[PDB]
Amino acid sequence: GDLSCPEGLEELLSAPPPDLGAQRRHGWNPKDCSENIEVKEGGLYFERRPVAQSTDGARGKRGYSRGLHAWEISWPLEQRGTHAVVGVATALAPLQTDHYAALLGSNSESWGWDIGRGKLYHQSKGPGAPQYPAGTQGEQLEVPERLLVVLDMEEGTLGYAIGGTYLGPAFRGLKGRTLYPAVSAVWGQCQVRIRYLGER
């Protein structure tokens, strides 16, 4: 798993983590999220309000076009509901829709891992979406509360780490974009945290 990781990731993750100011600066954007989401603590987490028949997303404040970036998402297991998707989006991706869906990854402007189903979405309405990671250690993975999201803008990849192990690149084809941390959620009163881990 780790032999596929971006250059510099092991060193980035071993460094002292960004302080609370940096976590807020790179955290969720109150000015760039669904109307049904509130961003709290200056960006450290968001809460989705209990609005029926809605999927709701948020972007981070800072868009990345070069180098290696990583962040931790913390998403309580019992607050995931039917469609919990973690990834990245351009500034143009839609962040709300009036039904329950994997909104993140349902278009050209977003890329998501469904942490309930283990499926990857890009330009996908869901039918046929591939498993990630591929394999049997892949067929049994339960995504725990915390996961790392790893964006390599030199290779143009998005991948994830759990429990200290990089799980491989999930998506390629990201170069020449400005990409923001993103999630889409459906669960009433879910509280999803973002913890920026820095850049190389």
Binding site: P50, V51, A52, S54, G81, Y100, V186, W187, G188
Partner: peptide
């Protein structure tokens, strides 16, 4: 509340 903990 519905399946996703949202107000009906």
């Amino acid at each position: 509340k519905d399946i996703n903990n949202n107000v009906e």
